[PDB]
Amino acid sequence: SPEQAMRERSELARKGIARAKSVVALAYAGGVLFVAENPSRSLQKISELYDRVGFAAAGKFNEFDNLRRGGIQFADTRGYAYDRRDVTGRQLANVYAQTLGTIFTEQAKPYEVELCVAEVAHYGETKRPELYRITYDGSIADEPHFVVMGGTTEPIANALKESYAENASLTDALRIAVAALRALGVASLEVAVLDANRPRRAFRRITGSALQALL
Amino acid sequence: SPEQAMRERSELARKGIARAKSVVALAYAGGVLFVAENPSRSLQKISELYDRVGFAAAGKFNEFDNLRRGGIQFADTRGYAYDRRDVTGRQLANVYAQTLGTIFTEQAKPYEVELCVAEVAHYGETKRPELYRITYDGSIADEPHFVVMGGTTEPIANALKESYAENASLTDALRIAVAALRALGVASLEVAVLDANRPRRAFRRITGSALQALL
Amino acid sequence: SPEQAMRERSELARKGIARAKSVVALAYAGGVLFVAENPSRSLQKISELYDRVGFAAAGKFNEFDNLRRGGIQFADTRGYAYDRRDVTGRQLANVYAQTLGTIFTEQAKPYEVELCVAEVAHYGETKRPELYRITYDGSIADEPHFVVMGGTTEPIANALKESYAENASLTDALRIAVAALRALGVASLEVAVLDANRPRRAFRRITGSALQALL
Amino acid sequence: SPEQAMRERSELARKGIARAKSVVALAYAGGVLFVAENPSRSLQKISELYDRVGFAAAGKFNEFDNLRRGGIQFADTRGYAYDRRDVTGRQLANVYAQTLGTIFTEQAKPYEVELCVAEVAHYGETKRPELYRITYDGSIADEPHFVVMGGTTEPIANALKESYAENASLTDALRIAVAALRALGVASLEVAVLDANRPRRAFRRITGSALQALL
Amino acid sequence: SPEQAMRERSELARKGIARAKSVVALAYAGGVLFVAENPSRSLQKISELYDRVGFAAAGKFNEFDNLRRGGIQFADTRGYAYDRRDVTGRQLANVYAQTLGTIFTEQAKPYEVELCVAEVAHYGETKRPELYRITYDGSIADEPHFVVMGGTTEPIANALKESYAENASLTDALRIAVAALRALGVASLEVAVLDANRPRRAFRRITGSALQALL
Amino acid sequence: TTIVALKYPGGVVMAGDRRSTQGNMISGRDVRKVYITDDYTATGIAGTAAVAVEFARLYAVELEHYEKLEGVPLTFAGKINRLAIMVRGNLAAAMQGLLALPLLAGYDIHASDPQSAGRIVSFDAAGGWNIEEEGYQAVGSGSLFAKSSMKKLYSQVTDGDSGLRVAVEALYDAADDDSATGGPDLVRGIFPTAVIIDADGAVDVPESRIAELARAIIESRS
Amino acid sequence: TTIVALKYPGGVVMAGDRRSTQGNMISGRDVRKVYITDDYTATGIAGTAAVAVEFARLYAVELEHYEKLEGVPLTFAGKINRLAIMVRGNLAAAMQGLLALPLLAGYDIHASDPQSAGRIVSFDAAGGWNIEEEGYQAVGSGSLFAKSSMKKLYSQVTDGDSGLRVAVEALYDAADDDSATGGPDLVRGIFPTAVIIDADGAVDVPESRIAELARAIIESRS
Amino acid sequence: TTIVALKYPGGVVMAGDRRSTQGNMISGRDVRKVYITDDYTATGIAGTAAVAVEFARLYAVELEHYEKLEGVPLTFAGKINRLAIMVRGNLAAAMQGLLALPLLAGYDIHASDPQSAGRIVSFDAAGGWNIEEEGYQAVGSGSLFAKSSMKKLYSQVTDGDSGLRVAVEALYDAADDDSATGGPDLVRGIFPTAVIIDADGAVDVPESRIAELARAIIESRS
Amino acid sequence: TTIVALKYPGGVVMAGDRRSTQGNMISGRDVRKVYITDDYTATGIAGTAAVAVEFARLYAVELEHYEKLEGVPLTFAGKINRLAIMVRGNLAAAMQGLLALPLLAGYDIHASDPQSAGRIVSFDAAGGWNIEEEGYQAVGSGSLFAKSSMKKLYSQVTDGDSGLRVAVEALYDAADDDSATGGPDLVRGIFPTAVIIDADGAVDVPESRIAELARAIIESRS
C-alpha cells in the first residue's frame, strides 16, 4: 500500500519544514533581493552558484549544504565543458528537482528542505529576473514576482501581495521585506543582492554599516 | 511509518547519552578551557585535532574514538593538500555533522555521543574563540560562551550562567568550572587548555602538581 | 523498536556467559597471575599476544580463539611496521573493543565472551601492571587490582577483595587465587604468569611438578 | 527474538540427528577402532584424512561428504605448505568446529551431522590416542576413552562404560563394540582401524574373510 | 520456524511428483532395462550420460533436462581431464545429490523430479549392475534390483517384487516390466537398454519393428 | 616567447611578447600570454601555445571553485602549492613534447608591510618553486638576455612607470638578441601587453602608454 | 646427469648418477634423482636440480590427493596425462632456464599378461609422450652413450640381476664418455642408486649389491 | 650540495650549503637544505632540490600524524624504519632521475648516558641504514673532501662551539674543492645555515656567529 | 663478505667478517652478518647489505608468528622449506641487482643421537637446498679460499675451541686472498663475530676469545 507510505513521508517532510525560519526573495529594479532570519554569523542560508545564479534555502543545514555543493560542482563542470555563457538557472533547477525526487522515493528519510533558484540578465542586456521553486518531492514551479518558504507562509504571502510595487528601489524593497517578515535590526538578519550592473559576478553581501544605513 | 522509527531512535540516543558524565567547555582570556570527569588515567575524553582546533566529547568511548581518528585524518590530509593555515574548525564541524547524520539514518543503531569543536586565533592576532555543538542526529549549533554536554545539563547551565565573567583568568575560570560541575580534587578530573600565546601548537594538558596548585 | 532487539541480544549474551567457568587474573610483585578452571589439556583459555602482553578469556572456544588469532596478527603486523617497543596493551584492547562492538550490532548472533588484556613493564624498568576488561557489547574498563569473569562473579569478587595484599609472592598469590576460586589440585587448573624479570618474553606456563610444589 | 530462532534451529538439528544410525569409536592397544552400521557397500561413513588422522561421522551423507572433502583439502595444503609432520588432528578439529559454527548461524538450514576426529602416535613413538567430538553448533570437546554418536546414545554409553578395559586386543575390542551396538554379522557393519605399527599410513579397512574370522 | 517451511516445501515437492507418469528400471542378464510411459515422440525421459552410464527421470521436463545437460557436461569434462575409464556412476550420483540439496534449500521453488543412475561393467569383464536413486531433497540410496519412481509406487513395487527373476532375458524382462506398469502397445512406451556386450558405448534405443516383435 | 616580471615599491608588473612560430615560419602576430588569474595574481606561461591557454583556464577555474566552496580565498602558499602540483602532473606530457613553463606574480594583502607585499615565484621542470629575492625574473627562450638587461637597468626603478619602462626595454633587448621573440611592430601597430598589480588590484595597461614607451626607446637607441 | 631404465621379464628397473655441477665446478656428490611416486611407479627427472625435487613432490602429492578423494587409484593413462600436463605447464620456465626432463617407469597390475606388465614412458619438450616398445630408454646429458651401450648389452638381460648389471654398465659408460656424469667413487664410497619394481611393489636396492657390481665391472674393464 | 654532521659531548650539530645549479649555470643562492623534523631530530636531504622539500614535509607530517593518533612519540628505531621505507619506495624515481640522499641526526632522551645521546644515521641507495660510530658523516657531491677534512680536524672538538667551527671549516674545504658547492659570500652576505640539538631541543643557529666564524677562517687561511 | 660454518662433536659454530664496500671504496667497518633466529638456529646472509637485514628480520618474525599461532615450534624441514620459499621468491630482485645468499646452521633436539645433531644447510640461486655431509660450508666472495683452508684444517677439530680456531683461521685466509673481505684490525680493535649452538642453545661468543685467537694466529704466521 504505497498510499500510506507516501502520505506518511509527505507528513514527515511537511512537519519538518513547518518548524523553521522563513526566507523571502523578491525582484527589484537592480535584480533579486534575499532576506533571511539567520542569527548565526557562521552558517549561511543564502549563497551563489555561478556568475548570475543565486541560491537560497530553508530547513536542515546539513542537507541544503550538500545540495549547494552539488550545484556548485555541476555549474563549474558545465561552464568548463562548453562556455561560461551557456549556464542557465533552469539547468540547475532541473538537476535539483531530479535529485530531490530521487531522494524522496528511494531513501529511507526524505529531505525537509525548500529550494529557490534566481537568475538575472547579463551585463549590457535587459531581461526580467527568473525565480524557481523546488519542493521536497521534486515539484518545480515558476514564480514571476516573489517566493516565500519556511514556516508559515500564508500571512507572509498576503502581506507581500499588498505592498509589492514593481520596479522599486533597494531601500524600499528592503523595507517591504522587513515589514513582511516582522508581521529586526542588524542582528538576526541576512541580506544578499544579485546586482545586474556588475561586470561579471553579480552576488554580494551587505552587512554592518551599509546594512544599518539602508535599514 | 517513519514517525515511530525516528521517535524510537531518538529515545534510544537520548537514554544512552543521559546516563553519562558531564563535560564543560568555556572560553577565558587565554583561550578555551576543557574540564571533564574522567577517573581513568588511560582513556581520555579531551584531545586535539590540529594546531588550533580541540576535541571533546561525552558518551561511549569506542564511538567518539573513531570520530576523533577520522577528524585527525581529515585535518592532516586537508593541511597537506593546500596549507596549514587553511584548516578551520567549521570544516571539521561540518564533516562531523554529516557523518553523524549519515550514521543516524542508515545504520541500525545510532551513536550515543555529543561532540564539541573549539578553535582559537593564530599567534599575533586577536579573534574571539569559536565553539560548535554537534548532536547525535547531526544538528550543528553555534555557542558564543560555553557548551555543556553529558548527563543532566539544566542545573549545570543555570549554575554556569550566573558566575561566568568574560575575560577571566585561568585559576578563576577553573574555580567556576569545578563549582558548576560539583553542583573533586586532582583525581576524577581531566583538564586541558587551548593556549593562544603559543607559537604553533595550542593544546596542552595540566595534571599533577600544576593542577593541584591551580585548584 | 531497537529497544526490544537490544534487550534480547543482551539477555542472550548474558545467559550464554552465565553458564561458564570462571577466570581470575591478579597482579603480584612479579607481574600478573592467570588461573583458570580448564580440565582439558589440549584447549587453553590463557595465552600470550606479544613480548609483554597476555591474553585470557571465558566463554565459547571457537570465538575467543579467533579473537586471539586476530590479536596476534595485529600485534605482529604492528611490531614489524614500526618497532617491537611500540606495541602497547591499550592498542590491542581498543581493537578488541571495536571488533566486539561491530560484531554485536551487525551480526545475527552476538559473541558470548569476556576478554582481559594484561601488560607488564620492560626489563630494567619499574611500572605498575595494567589490566583491561572488554565486554560483549564493546565496553572497555580499567581495573587496577584484579579482574573476575565467567559464571557468577559477586561472591568471588567479595572473597578476593578481602585477602588481596599488594606486593605479595607467587605462592601466596596462588593460594589466594585457589581459595577464591574454590569458594582443586593439579588437575582442572591452568596457571600462567607474566614474569617481569625475563629479558624479552614474559609469558610462561607452570604445570606438573612445579605447580604441585607451589600449590 | 533470537531465542526462539536458536531454539527452533537446535530442535531441527536434534530431530535430524536423532533418526540415524549409531557410530562407536574406541581406543585399543593398536590405535583406534571404528565400527558403524552401514548396510550399503558403496557409501562409507568412515574414512581417513592424513597419515595419522581418521574421520568418522553420522547423519546426512551429502553434508559430511563435503566436510570430509574440505578436511582432506586442508590437510593436503597444510602438509605441502610446511611439512608432513606438522599436521595434527587438533588443527582439523578446530577448522571443522569453525565451519560448523559458521554454517549454523548464517545458513538457512543447519547441518544434522556429528563429527569425530582421531589421531595416533607416529612410528617408533609412544603416545596416547586423541579423540575429539564436534557438534552441529560448533562445540568441540575432548574424550579420552570413547565417542558415541548417532541415534540414542545413553544406553550405548552405559553399556560401553561397563566392559571397556584399557589396553585390550583387536578381537576383544571388536567384541565389546559389537555387543554394545547390538544392545550383526559381516553384513550391515563397517570396520576400520588406525594401526600405529605401520610405517607411514595408519588407515586400513577390514572386510570379508578377515572380518568374519575376527568376529 | 524452519519446521513449517520445510514441511511445506516437502509437501509441494510430493504433490508435484505424485501427479506424473511412472518409470521402471530393472537389471537383466544383458544389463539394465528402462521402460517409461512417454506418448510424445520428441520429448525423451531416458537418455545416456557416458559410455557405461544411463539417465532416467520423472517429473517436469525443463528441470531434469537441465540436470541431464549438467551431468553430460560434468562427465565429458572429467573424462577429458584424466581418462575415459575413470568415470563412475557414483561420481555423477553424488553431484546430482549435491545439486538437488542445494536447490531445495536456497531456491524459492524446489524441484519436483526423481532421478536414477545406472551403470554396467566394461567389455570383457563381469560385474553386477549398480543402480542409484536420488530424491528432491538430495537423499541418495542404493538399490540392488530395481527402482520405481513417478506417481504411485506401492502397487507397482508389490507387483515387481513377485515376478522378478534374476538373470532373465530381454523379452521376459520386458514382459514383466509391461505387466507391472499396466497393473500398452508400441505407442505410449519408451524402451532403452544398456547392453554390456558392446565394445565402447552401451546405450541404444529399441523402437518400431524390433519393439513390436519383442513385445 | 619571453615573459618578464619585476618588483617596484608598492606592487609588481608583468609583460610579454606577441609572437608565435612553427619552426622558422611566423604563424602568430597578436598572441596574448599574460592573464589575470584573480583580483591579486597574474600568471604567464611559456612554451607550447596550446598548453598555456588550457593551463591558465584550469588554474583560474580551480581557484574560483575553491573560493565558492569555502567562502574564503586561498592563501599565497596554497596557490603556490596548487600551481606546483599542476606543473608536476605534466611531466609525461613535457617529455612527449607538451611543455609549459609558468611564472607567477602577486600581491599579498595579509603582509605586515604594504610596501614589500609584491611576490615573484618561479618554477622548474621537476616541479620545484622558489621565491625571488633579487626583484626580477624572466622565462622563455630569450630569458637570459632579458635578465642580463634587468641586472643593469634595475637601479633606475622607483615606481610603476620606471618598472614598466625597464620591462619594455628588457623585452626589446630579448627580441633584439633572439629571433623567436617579436619586437615592436610600427608598421602594423602591435605592442607588448602588460599587467600592473597594486593594493587596489590587477589592472591591464592601456596600449597608448606602451606604444609611447616603445617609441621613446626606439628613438633613444637610434 | 643420466637416468636409465630398462625392462626385464617380470618388472622394470631404474638407476641414476649422483653428481651435480655448476658449470665446470663440482658442487654435489651424493644427489638422489630417482624417487618412488607410489606403490607401483618410479620417476626420474633430469635437468635443473631444484626443479626436479619440486616436480616429484607435486606429482606424489597430486596422486595421493586423488586417491584419498576418490578412494580408487588412478589408471596408468591418467597418471601419464597428469605428468604430461605438468610438463606442458612449464614451457615458459624452461624457456627462461628452468627445464625438467622426466622419465617414468611403472608396473601395470591390470594387464592381462603378468610377464609383460612393465612400462617405460618418455616425454619431450613440447609435452608429448610415447610408450617405449624396444625395452630401454635414457635421459640426461649422457643419454646417447648409455643408449648406445644398452643397444649392444640388451641381449644378456634375463632377470632382475642381469637388468641391474646392464643398467650399472650403461651408467659407467655414460660417465666415461661425459664429464658431467659422476662415476663410481671407490675412495669415498658413493655408488649409483637403483629402484626395482615387480608384482609386489617398488623396493629400493641396497648399496651392497650395487657396490659389488661396480667393483666387478671395474675389475673386468681393467 | 654538501651537508655535514658531527657529534660533540652533549649533543649534535648539522650544517649545509646554499647553492643550487642547473648543469654549469648558477640558479640558486639562498637555498635551505636543513630542516627541523621534530623537537629532537633534524634532517638534511641532498640531490634534486624539488624532491628534498617534499621528502622533509612528508616525513614531518607522518611523524606528527602518528604522535597525534597514538598520543606518544615514536622511538628512534621507528623513525629510522619509516625513513628507510620512504627511501626504499623511491627506487624507480631515482632510476628515472629523481634521487634523494637523506641524512639524519637526533638526540635520544631515553638513553642511559646523557653525554652520549647524540646519533647520526646514514642511508644508502638500496635503502639500508647504518649508525655512525666514528662521530661524523657527510653527504652530497663534495662529501669526500669534507670527510677528509673532519678526519684531521675532529681532535679539536670539545663543545658546541668547536663542533660548529669544525663543520664550517669542512664546508669551506668542500666548497674550495668542488665547484657545485657554494662558499661564503662576503659581497652579498649569505652564509651556511646550522642547527644544534641538545638536551633542551633543536634550535637554529643565528647568522651572526656563522658569519664571525667564516670571517675568522677566511682571515686565518689568507 | 665471507661467512663460514662447521660441525664439531656436540654442536655447530658460525662466523663472519665485518667489512662492507661500495666498489673499491670502504664504507663499513663494523657490519654484523650473523644473527640468531631462534633458540637453536643461526642464519648468515651474504650479498647486498640492505637485503640481508630485511631477510633475517622477516624470517625471525615468520618463525615467531607460527610458534605463537600454533603453540608448537616448527620442525627443521619446515624451517628449511620456508627459507627456500623466501629465497625462491626473490629471483626477480636478484636479476635486478638485489641478491641474497643465505646459510643456515642449527641443532636438532629431536635427533636420536645427541652427538650428531648439528646441521648445515646451503642454498643455490634457483632456490634448491642441500644438507652438507662433509662437515663445513662457506658463502660469499671469498668462500673458495676459506673452503680450501678448511679442507686441510678440518682434521684438528675436536671440540668447540678447535672449531672456533679453525673458523677464525679460514676467515683470515679468505681475507688474505680477497680484498673485499676485512681481516682483523689491531689498530682499531675490530674482530669477527661468532655464534656457538649446542644442546643448551645459541650463545654469542665474547670478543676476548676471538681477539686472543686472532693474535695467536697472527703471531704464528709471522
From Swiss-Prot, chains A, B, C, D, E:
Cellular component aspect of the GO annotation: cytoplasm; peptidoglycan-based cell wall; plasma membrane; proteasome core complex, alpha-subunit complex
Pathway: Protein degradation; proteasomal Pup-dependent pathway
Disruption phenotype: Cells lacking the core proteasome prcBA subunits exhibit reduced growth and persistence in mice. They are also attenuated in interferon-gamma-deficient mice. They also display increased sensitivity to reactive nitrogen intermediates (RNI) and increased resistance to oxidative stress.
Entry-linked CDD domains: proteasome_protease_HslV
Major subcellular location class: cytoplasm
Keywords for this protein: Acetylation, Cytoplasm, Phosphoprotein, Proteasome, Virulence
Biotechnology: In the course of search for new antibiotics, a class of oxathiazol-2-one compounds has been identified that selectively inhibits the M.tuberculosis proteasome over the human proteasome and that kills non-replicating M.tuberculosis.
PANTHER family found in the cross-reference section: PROTEASOME SUBUNIT ALPHA/BETA
Further remarks about this protein from its record: Was identified as a high-confidence drug target.
Protein family according to the UniProt entry: Belongs to the peptidase T1A family.
Assembly notes: The 20S proteasome core is composed of 14 alpha and 14 beta subunits that assemble into four stacked heptameric rings, resulting in a barrel-shaped structure. The two inner rings, each composed of seven catalytic beta subunits, are sandwiched by two outer rings, each composed of seven alpha subunits. The catalytic chamber with the active sites is on the inside of the barrel. Has a gated structure, the ends of the cylinder being occluded by the N-termini of the alpha-subunits. Is capped by the proteasome-associated ATPase, ARC (Mpa).
Function: Component of the proteasome core, a large protease complex with broad specificity involved in protein degradation. The M.tuberculosis proteasome is able to cleave oligopeptides not only after hydrophobic but also after basic, acidic and small neutral residues. In complex with the ATPase Mpa, degrades protein targets conjugated to a prokaryotic ubiquitin-like protein (Pup). Among the identified substrates of the M.tuberculosis proteasome are the pupylated FabD, PanB and Mpa proteins.
Protein name: Proteasome subunit alpha
Organism: Mycobacterium tuberculosis (strain ATCC 25618 / H37Rv)
Lineage: Bacteria, Bacillati, Actinomycetota, Actinomycetes, Mycobacteriales
Gene: prcA
From Swiss-Prot, chains F, G, H, I:
Record entry for activity regulation: The formation of the proteasomal ATPase ARC-20S proteasome complex, likely via the docking of the C-termini of ARC into the intersubunit pockets in the alpha-rings, may trigger opening of the gate for substrate entry. Interconversion between the open-gate and close-gate conformations leads to a dynamic regulation of the 20S proteasome proteolysis activity. In vitro, chymotryptic and tryptic activities of the proteasome are both completely inhibited by epoxomicin and by the peptidyl boronate inhibitor MLN-273. Also inhibited by Mg(2+), Ca(2+) and SDS.
CC terms in the record's Gene Ontology section: cytoplasm; extracellular region; plasma membrane; proteasome core complex, beta-subunit complex
Name of the featured protein: Proteasome subunit beta
Record carries keyword Amino-acid biosynthesis: no
Natural source organism: Mycobacterium tuberculosis (strain ATCC 25618 / H37Rv)
Record note on biotechnological use: In the course of search for new antibiotics, a class of oxathiazol-2-one compounds has been identified that selectively inhibits the M.tuberculosis proteasome over the human proteasome and that kills non-replicating M.tuberculosis.
Catalytic residues (UniProt): 1
First and last residues shown, out of full length: 58 to 279 of 291
Organism lineage string: Bacteria, Bacillati, Actinomycetota, Actinomycetes, Mycobacteriales
E.C. designation(s): 3.4.25.1
Gene name, Swiss-Prot/TrEMBL: prcB
Enzyme class: hydrolase
Disruption phenotype: Cells lacking the core proteasome prcBA subunits exhibit reduced growth and persistence in mice. They are also attenuated in interferon-gamma-deficient mice. They also display increased sensitivity to reactive nitrogen intermediates (RNI) and increased resistance to oxidative stress.
Domains as described in the record: In contrast to Rhodococus, the M.tuberculosis proteasome does not require the propeptide of PrcB for correct folding and assembly.
